[PDB]
């Protein structure tokens, strides 16, 4: 079984926009916007939704950027995750019950209280190749095993 979640990075020159998860599962750590994808709705659906609701952006084109399988180790279900870039947007990003945002700087990015992948994966992601990889974790702070190619090479 996979779990089908999404993610996205508003981005502008030399910075991205995150929040600080307030609740539930990541609580603490800085992120992109998003959550599930429902079934009947496309990933890029419930992106577009899970933004507004969170930072209180509308975005118009999303641009498809990566796609990551994440295991844990002694667990049975996967995360199949689908992330997105959006360079433009309409609205002011404001703090919702679910995130806090954020502005950083590209030399700034609060890799030490973000989940454990996006410091490996990040460099893809700003430079615009579109990427494919597989995480194993080892509980929710140990990378025990980690993937990543362009999907350019495969
Ligand atoms: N950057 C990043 N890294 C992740 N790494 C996997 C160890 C969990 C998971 C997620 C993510 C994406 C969408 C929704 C949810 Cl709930 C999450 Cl947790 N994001």
Redesign the pocket.
Known sequence: TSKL???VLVVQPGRVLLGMKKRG??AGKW??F??KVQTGETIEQAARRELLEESGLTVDTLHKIGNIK?EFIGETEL?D?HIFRADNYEGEPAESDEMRPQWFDIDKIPFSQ?????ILWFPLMLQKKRFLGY?K?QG?DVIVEHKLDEVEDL
């Not at 973000?114 to 996006?118: I, K, Q, S």
């Open positions: 979640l999404t993610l599962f990541g992120n992109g998003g959550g994440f995360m995750v973000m989940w454990a992948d996006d995480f974790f929710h």
